[PDB]
Design a protein around this ligand. Structure first.
Ligand code: NAP
Ligand code: FOL
Ligand code: MN
Ligand code: MN
Ligand code: MN
Length: 159
């Protein structure tokens, strides 16, 4: 099973200048809980944005060019990325925009955080078709001393 996980600001913005400008510790904790002990697939730009391997997960990086770090696994196509995960119950695709576009048609589940923040961005989550997806979990949180925007954790499953 393939799943996508992402945090979206207003208008589906996910990034700006290869960075995520906000800081929501509660959402990073949610990301960790839902990805730990699973393979994560990311594109090269997102690898560079994170800047290090994510511990406790098999890190698989898509790039058309040879890898430059043997602490992670490098693959050259979507099918190779999936194969490199092996026989696991759930593969987590962690972006960015161009990678999410390619894996969305193959995904059964979306883990989306909707952040009530306006962000100038240059990267968006794909414009998926809402009729294809059932919301099976949603949990709203107001802003607090640690998290400066309100946010909604949602899980959607392909109908
Ligand atoms: N808010 C969130 O949830 C979230 C999550 C992830 C990322 N982001 C943000 O998203 C932005 C990065 O997204 P992006 O769209 O620019 O880049 P991306 O999807 O991370 O990376 C694209 C790169 O991945 C490689 N790639 C993708 N598909 C491939 C394929 N089928 N075969 C081979 N290589 C492939 C290519 O690398 P080569 O050029 O080396 O061939 C391509 O240039 C950053 O701002 C980051 O902060 C946000
Ligand atoms: N909901 C969601 N939020 C995100 O921030 C997110 N980020 C990415 C890509 N970028 C990043 C950037 C940093 C870390 C990171 O430092 N994660 C730690 C945090 C642990 C914690 O704070 O409790 C990790 O071990 O996962 C993960 C992904 C992809 N999907 C996402 N999905
Ligand atoms: Mn092929
Ligand atoms: Mn198999
Ligand atoms: Mn806000």
């Amino acid at each position: 099973m393939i799943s996508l996980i992402a945090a979206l600001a207003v208008d589906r913005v996910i990034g700006m200048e290869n960075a995520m400008p906000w800081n929501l510790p509660a959402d990073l904790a949610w990301f960790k809980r839902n990805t730990l002990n699973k393979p994560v697939i990311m594109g090269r730009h997102t690898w560079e944005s994170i800047g290090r391997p994510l511990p406790g997960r098999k890190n698989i990086i898509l790039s058309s060019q040879p890898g430059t770090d043997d602490r992670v696994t490098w693959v050259k196509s979507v099918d190779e990325a999936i194969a490199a995960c092996g026989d696991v119950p759930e593969i987590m695709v962690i972006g960015g925009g161009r990678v999410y576009e390619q894996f969305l048609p193959k995904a059964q589940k979306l883990y989306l955080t909707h952040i009530d923040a306006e962000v100038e961005g240059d990267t968006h989550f794909p414009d998926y078709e809402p009729d294809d997806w059932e919301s099976v979990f949603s949990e709203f949180h107001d802003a607090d001393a640690q998290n400066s925007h309100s946010y909604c954790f949602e899980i959607l499953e392909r109908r």
